[PDB]
Symmetry: none
Subunit: 79 residues, 6 copies
Amino acid sequence: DALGLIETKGLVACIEAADAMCDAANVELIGYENVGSGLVTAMVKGDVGAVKAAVDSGVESAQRIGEVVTSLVIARPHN
Amino acid sequence: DALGLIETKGLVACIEAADAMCDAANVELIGYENVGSGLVTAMVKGDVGAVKAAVDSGVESAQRIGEVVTSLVIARPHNDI
Amino acid sequence: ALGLIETKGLVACIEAADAMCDAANVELIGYENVGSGLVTAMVKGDVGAVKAAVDSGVESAQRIGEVVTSLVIARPHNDIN
Amino acid sequence: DALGLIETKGLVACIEAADAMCDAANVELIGYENVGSGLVTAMVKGDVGAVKAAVDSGVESAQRIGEVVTSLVIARPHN
Amino acid sequence: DALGLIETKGLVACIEAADAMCDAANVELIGYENVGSGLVTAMVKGDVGAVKAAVDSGVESAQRIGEVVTSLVIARPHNDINKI
Amino acid sequence: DALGLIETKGLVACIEAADAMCDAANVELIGYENVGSGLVTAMVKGDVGAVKAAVDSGVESAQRIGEVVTSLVIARPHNDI
């Protein structure tokens, strides 16, 4: 199904984005990824509609406490 | 129970934030996390009241010696976190 | 043939990899991360398919993030690891 | 026992800070810690008075050859 | 045996430098080191003549796609270096 | 015994500094240390005279190919160092 991503500067903003994503819609948190330079990504999976709602909520909440670098929804991601 | 987080620029400010958190309330220091660009986070667990008091004290103390980037208290963290 | 796109940040890299796979008959080998936010996506296929994939991946990744470098190696040396 | 910390940009400035700390007062060098991004911390232990003297001397000496990012004395660290 | 080194800003320029080095002469790719701030080094070994040719080719090719920070050939590395 | 240190931006400049240090005087290469952000330190030990000569030569040679960030000679390091 669809993939939702939120990349923030700092771990705390990422945890807030992931918490908000799970509370907003029927999505499953796959995990976190850290590529250095403070860039932390939270990844969720679910139906396109749930993932779009999750990413929107996650971005809004994370922005309140930290910097959201990028966000993306891939409706039909290749394996 | 509740999760308390303080993210600082540099290790020394993080150690001060963690020391202040443990001294302020009945919370347990889970550990540290470092995501690069000098961003270091200290994490504690306990009842929401103890965690709120710990985070408040940790932020105030760490700010005196370094930069606090972010702080957060999650009363009931999601199972997936 | 090997196709490479290095970005600043993971999300731009995932977008570059998604665009590469959708543009031509190439296989995503994987990702590589050397820190400092530098993330590379690697694809394999015929030189024509890989050139088309890299072009499309760069164009789409640039719309959401910074593409640091891109490269097509038509015939990689065995020692390339 | 009090904890003395000096965080520098670079390892050489940190080694100079640690050498100066040990020569200034009756403190023991516990070790060095590195969190990446060139941030290196030297940690000493001893009585609060010895640790304050050590940190002051370590900062002054390290600044002559490199950048001191932060310094701290914790008179009674949590166990 | 001589040691050849090329340090680039980023992994992709480094891959290009290492690919070019192996294609240019009879050298063996030992591997790579990464020390942060995006600095990636590719290391080769062989006779001094093969290593000089490999490094020259690797630098020329890598520069076309990225930044080459430094390059070096050590004709007879010190015994203490051989540990790394 | 004296301690000699050279910290460079990049591994290659550090290897050149270490090679030059060993060739300049009767010093022993203890090893290398990397604290991130491209900062790499080469450490030698020997008599104060040999270490001063080694560091001088290492700095001059390393500067030709890269950036020397710092250099230091400690004539009498504390045992704890």
